[PDB]
């Protein structure tokens, strides 16, 4: 009936610009756990409030904290279409999504280490706005500066080759068994490669099969 995707893979694998690409195509929102917890921190609710205890500690958010703000969130859109970006991340997750719905469709990124570095090193951020900055595509206006208030451009942690390599190790190891068992169901597809451009129309074509693709009023 209603679709249920998901598309894994490591940090900086392309998962966010597939999405949009999805968005344009299909007029399909993305769901993010980091999205979600963004939120759940800005209006200070009670997970919101765990995650921050971890965090002030300089903590990883558990996986627990994660999954309860997430079936939180699905479990009040269940009229829609989902389209989830990089959950579930563990076999748990994979199963506490079971209980509330038949995953249709999972969609897998295999991004060579070298590439995700590159990327990640091409992308700075305006911290207070959020404003992203992929120096390739859309580089800020001014050298080093925010497009509205010229505030200098940061690099997250999380960007840097280090913190990359480390993501990509963490991700490895957690990774098998979800792909395992989605294999076992014969909803994963994977792709490969250093280039967006060259998977995305691999994974159109999969998605127009489960949904119908915008065109224009004179399109006809
Ligand atoms: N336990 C726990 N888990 C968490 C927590 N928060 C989030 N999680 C999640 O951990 C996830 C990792 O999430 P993350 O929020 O820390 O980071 P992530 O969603 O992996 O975001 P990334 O932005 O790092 O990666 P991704 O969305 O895959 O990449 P993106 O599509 O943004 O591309 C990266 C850059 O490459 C560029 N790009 C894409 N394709 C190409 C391309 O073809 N060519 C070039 N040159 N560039 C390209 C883009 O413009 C972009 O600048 C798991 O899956 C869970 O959802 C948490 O707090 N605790």
Redesign the pocket.
């Known amino acids: 009936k209603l679709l249920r995707a998901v598309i894994?893979?490591?940090?900086?694998?392309?998962?966010?610009?597939?999405?949009?690409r999805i968005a344009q195509n299909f007029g399909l929102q993305h769901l993010?756990?980091?999205h979600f917890?963004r939120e759940n921190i800005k209006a200070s609710t009670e997970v919101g409030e765990m995650?921050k205890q971890?965090i002030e500690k300089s903590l990883?958010?558990?996986?627990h904290?994660?999954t309860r703000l997430m079936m939180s969130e699905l479990e009040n859109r269940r009229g829609q279409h989902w389209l989830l970006?990089?959950?579930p991340?563990t076999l748990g997750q994979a199963e506490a999504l079971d209980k509330i719905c038949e995953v249709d469709l999972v969609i897998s990124?295999n991004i060579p280490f070298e590439?995700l570095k590159?990327?990640?090193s091409?992308?700075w951020i305006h911290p207070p706005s959020g404003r992203?900055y992929?120096l390739?595509?859309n580089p800020p206006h001014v050298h080093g500066i925010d497009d509205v208030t010229g505030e200098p451009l940061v690099q997250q942690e999380?960007?840097k080759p280090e913190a990359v390599a480390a993501?990509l190790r963490q991700?490895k190891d957690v990774a098998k068994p979800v792909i395992e068992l989605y294999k076992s169901r014969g909803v994963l597809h994977q792709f490969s490669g250093?280039?967006?451009?060259?998977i995305w129309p691999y994974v159109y074509t999969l998605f127009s099969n489960k949904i119908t693709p915008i065109q224009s009023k004179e399109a006809y």
């Open positions: 894994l893979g490591p940090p900086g694998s392309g998962k966010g610009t597939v999405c949009q993010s756990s980091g917890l995650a971890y990883l958010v558990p996986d904290v994660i970006d990089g959950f991340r990124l590439t590159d990327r990640l091409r992308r992203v992929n390739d595509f999380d960007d993501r991700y250093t280039e967006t451009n060259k």
